[model samples]
Target: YNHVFASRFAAFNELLSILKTKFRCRVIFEETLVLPKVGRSRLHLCKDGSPRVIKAVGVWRNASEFILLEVDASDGVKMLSTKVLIGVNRETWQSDFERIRRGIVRNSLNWPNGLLYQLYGKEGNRGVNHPKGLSELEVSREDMEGWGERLIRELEH
Candidate 1:
């Protein structure tokens, strides 16, 4: 699957500018040049003039690669947010292991015994795909994304 996070904070003039552009734009998930943890996107609109940008945290495809970069938008267009999805994969990840390992430092800071993180006896994609009966927070097909805000909120909490 693919993902994007976008918002139209532009004025009517911005919409006029958007309509004037010959290129195309959409909030749908398109194949992007994404990297594992640190993503790599080549959107022409990643310009200084743009008013929005999507940041994907991570993604999964069947049983292959996973990258981050959710959504990003700008101008006076309709703002959109992606639905919330939570899943488990193997016990660990091959992507950004260092950053994750570093996060352990937080244990010494706040959760000396370690924070409330999940750990499975399984490993690799197998672990994630068939994660032990863990809980999942499904996003409602409701409004254009209040879930995104909640995603960020509970993530830090």
Candidate 2:
């Protein structure tokens, strides 16, 4: 099940990659960050004494604007963590992303969690705030070929 989810995520990544050249955006992959453990001792450890980390996918419109995507499988199910930070303070954007990432890993922050949850939410995930042009963009692993082209076309506008 995890493998299936991961492959779907990979397909989504490929779809986003098309925007790299179409809009001259930068598509980053596999960014790892070590996060502080909560109150648990059963956490997995990395070689440097830090807990196991998740690799994030980042799409940058510029140095101060980007969307960060992460896959969370800590709850026996996979969840997509999407953070869209636009027009942020140039000096603080990096730290902002880190802060958001930490909040996500710690399960403290929840808004616009993912397409799956939004689809099944009571309010149907309506009223969730996101950037104007990007709020309508859907992130999923389905129909990589068609989805990729649609993403490119949407970003082009």
Candidate 3:
């Protein structure tokens, strides 16, 4: 959606054009972000909140920028709120998070949202960007979580 910040109407048109001209779909896109279960924390909160989640998509060396993972919203999977996850590397991601996360809490639009798996407690999820070539990454399975489910009722703390 960051491509020139087109108006919402234009964006819908563009989406329609892509669908009509490029490929045919039973439906184009559904506006839901229900996530599947992955860990204890995710399981602990599932019952206390709405029962819809988003699928977590990632990119590998050979895949597209985002790959929709095929998983169910059940236990043994750590699901996250995908509103921000889908935007990672796209227009919604911050230019610097690893830096601020390890130290300061600087203000930035892309400084991640309140995701379910936001490096809780002492996960030490930061990576060391050194040697000039080595790199680290973060992966998730937020395939079906919603945008404001947690903030609406269960997570109203």
Candidate 4:
């Protein structure tokens, strides 16, 4: 289980890097620190180099789908601006990336309703409760390994 989780996490980061390259957006990896509380977490650096405490670090199914919520920190945590990416197939990846690009450009993606609150609670206090609705996205261990291998293959060449 742990190995599958690590592989899935690596695959997700690979996808994130692709997005970063294609979209030219700032993608910060491995710099998030969850506070003592459950849902509260902070990024190591913001635009001005200050630590930015975010509302949540949304992890779904060992990060097969990862989300960053309310990155601006100044605004109230809203689902409207939450950023998320899910695992994708090598064949359909171009279209998927374009779709996400368009969504970010127009802010028109249909974000899962109340997902931030559902994942980390309204007050940011749901540490590993395995919040509802996320189980549906959970990939089995074998599938997770396969997906990671597929992503690695694609990323390699």
Candidate 5:
């Protein structure tokens, strides 16, 4: 519990530090709550040891859902602007998206976890190998894109 609190405090500070030292933008909203996941460990914190990963942080590009400019903190200190694949949302997301886009999302994003799907091809019960370090588990962008394409093809059911 103490570890969790320390992690959250550190993560929020990291975000502010990065933004102030790196960019020229004002944060409209921010939340450090992790939307729940199964595969993810309780203490395996997100970027900069934050409880929650960066859900979204960008300008309102559309009527709903800001096209977030994600930051990659794999190095733990230096944050890089990452190229990400936006996770798909259900019909219920429209309202939340709209509120966020309009700068009036009073409530937090309850279902805001970004899940990574390892569409491990080749048709077998491929056992999972959990790694200690996140870098060890890093999947290349090429592989991720390929997996996305493969999933798209296979989803025509």
Candidate 6:
């Protein structure tokens, strides 16, 4: 646990500082006194239609989360997210890494839409989860961006 936490903390610091000092990403939010101390993060724009990616450190004081979202002009929003949960054992750590690899493949294919469809729905019809605003929110990219160059550029480094 100590090694995993230490490495992630160090890597997190490198990214955070690079984003801040070199990339000019402003610290949009921060909180460190809690059980899961916060990992500093930076974000540039939020005008919708823009690509959105969020990196959260420590959901339970020992993990991290990354979520990448892109707006589809015709389909509203598409996102990919992965989390390194509490890695208490070796098997869980291996599985988490496996999931991370699967996440990459999942992001590349159209399977994610099926998952969303199961959560959201077609047109105004209800899906299994049947959350409100699913149809509307998933079908309109009014709040997203057409060219998410800034985020891409920052990530490129």
Q: Give the candidate number with the greatest lDDT.
A: 2
Q: TM-score: which is higher, 4 or 5? A: 5
**Candidate 3: segments with Cα more than 4 A from true spot:** 5-17, 24-33, 41-157
| Collision pairs in model 5 | none
Alpha-carbon RMSD, each predicted model: 18.0, 9.7, 18.0, 14.9, 13.9, 18.4
For candidate 6, write residues 59-78 as lDDT tens digits. 21113222222222222233
- TM-score of predicted structure 5: 0.26
Cα-based lDDT for every prediction: 0.27, 0.42, 0.26, 0.34, 0.32, 0.28
Best by TM-score: 2
Model 6 lDDT on a 0 to 1 scale: 0.28
Across 49-118, the per-residue lDDT of candidate 3 in tens digits comes to 6543333323222122222212222332332221222223444332323332312122211223233134
Q: List runs of model 6 lying over 4 Å from the truth.
A: 1-6, 31-151, 154-157
Model 5 misses residue 128 by how many Å?
29
Counting clashing residue pairs in each candidate, in order, gives: 20, 0, 30, 0, 0, 8
What lDDT does candidate 6 reach at residue 9?
Answer: 25
**Across residues 107-145, which tens digit of lDDT does each residue of candidate 4 receive?**
322333354344334443111111122224344544444
lDDT of 5 at 93: 39
Query: Candidate 3's error at 153, in angstroms?
Result: 43
Which regions of candidate 1 are displaced past 4 Å?
Answer: 1-41, 49-53, 56-69, 75-81, 90-157
Q: Which digits, one per residue and each the tens of the lDDT, describe model 5 over residues 1-157? A: 0112132223333333333333323444454334334343432245456543444443221232222323323435432232222332545434444433222111222212221122112221111211212234443434433333332232221
TM-score of each: 0.21, 0.47, 0.18, 0.24, 0.26, 0.23
Q: Indicate the residue-level lDDT of 90 in model 2.
A: 48
Please give the lDDT score at residue 18 for candidate 4.
Answer: 40
Report residue 69 deviation for candidate 2 (angstroms).
Answer: 2.3
lDDT per residue (tens digit) for residues 1-157 in model 2: 0113243334344545655654566765447665545445333343344455555555665353344444433333333433333233446646755655555545532333453233224332222121122222333333334444443333333
Off by over 4 Å in 4: 1-28, 31-107, 110-135
